[PDB]
Symmetry: C2
Subunit: 259 residues, 2 copies
Amino acid sequence: ESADLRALAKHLYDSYIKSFPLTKAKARAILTGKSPFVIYDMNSLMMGEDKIKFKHITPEVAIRIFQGCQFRSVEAVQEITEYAKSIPGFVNLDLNDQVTLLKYGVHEIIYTMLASLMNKDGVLISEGQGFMTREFLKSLRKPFGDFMEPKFEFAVKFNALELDDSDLAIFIAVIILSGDRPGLLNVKPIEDIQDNLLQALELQLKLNHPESSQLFAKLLQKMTDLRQIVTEHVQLLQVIKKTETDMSLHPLLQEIYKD
Amino acid sequence: ESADLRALAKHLYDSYIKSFPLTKAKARAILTGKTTDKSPFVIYDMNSLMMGEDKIKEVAIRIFQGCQFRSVEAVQEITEYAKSIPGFVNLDLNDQVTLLKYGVHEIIYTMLASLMNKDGVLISEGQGFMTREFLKSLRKPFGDFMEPKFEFAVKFNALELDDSDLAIFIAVIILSGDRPGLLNVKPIEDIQDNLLQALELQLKLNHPESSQLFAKLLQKMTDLRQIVTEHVQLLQVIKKTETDMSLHPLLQEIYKD
């Protein structure tokens, strides 16, 4: 029923508004038209640490930036976890499956929502008070210099689809309820829910983007690009964790950012 | 107009039959035990392999080079099919070559699923059947060659696509505007968008109770890309450790990254 699909869409939208403080609408306002403090080079970074109250700085710069990304990532996990619970049927799932879905889903969602905070020039940080430039991020040591660059490449393509929060809310739900995650015990109710969400996304896009032919298909294809980015991120993150990170980190901190 | 999309589906299915001698329909009739087709000789060990080599036509290398010869033939078929996709031959030639370069492997493993069950794979135009176990037991490098293809095939075959569906899906894959080094993405994307429309409708008409088959089919792209990457990096091993082994020019040129 159309009405029920529209109902699901509104429920998801409202839940997303509650779960995610910095929405695409808000991000887009900051980027185009207070105003963000820009970090373009070394001197601006250090000044940025004075002006902005970073929560991650624990008395090299490349590591400090990376830890900042880790801090935010861990915050995002909790926002996503809360959003998941609002999705009709999620909480009724086997508890191991819930964990499994979030375990493998959060990375894809992080980069989807990061795209909201990005343009081709840089990324909003610290609740949109900051803006770290893309160029500045590129010009870091060989490990960390290629960290965020494939996220920007993804974001530029993704943002060209010009989705809104109401679209993204349904898209994110679809990602979470993916029946193909390893270790799942009961795929039936997972795919039944995703079916329902996919139907709602379809209608949402048709109503919200009537001129954009096969936006649905295009959005589904981007999910493939997300999984590609995530596999590439993870393998890079193994080098980092093993090589340079666990050398400079406190044991407890390693536990928090164990991933 | 959905009538235009049906005509397109008809066109593509027709070109697929003409381009690909061994369809899924034929493959299934062989694998099931249907009387439209005949039974295959089964290779499950060194002995059967050797006996099979008599009837049908280092063991691990000889198998590998046979599979590579078949990949060459597949590339030829896929190239012929691509030319039939409306708009394709009108693209910049460099783009044509780039689309085939990255497209063929995703297609090869897609259509290889048609020849597979959980137990093994048809070979030599359906005359043979090589077991999964046998393939998995080969010398260390060549052992985990085919395993990921089977794992993909098991899940991909769960969709229960027929050839008509595959024809359009294969077309979608070729016309990917996200391939590295494309000169004109917009013309490619416009073709793919019409193909996607045609696929959508095809799956709704042909599989009317299979809910969100369209969305599920597109999600299988992830699995496809993974197979490719594993295969590529497996071939690098063979190049370093087996400097005696030749590689067909067509395949070299595809693998060139």
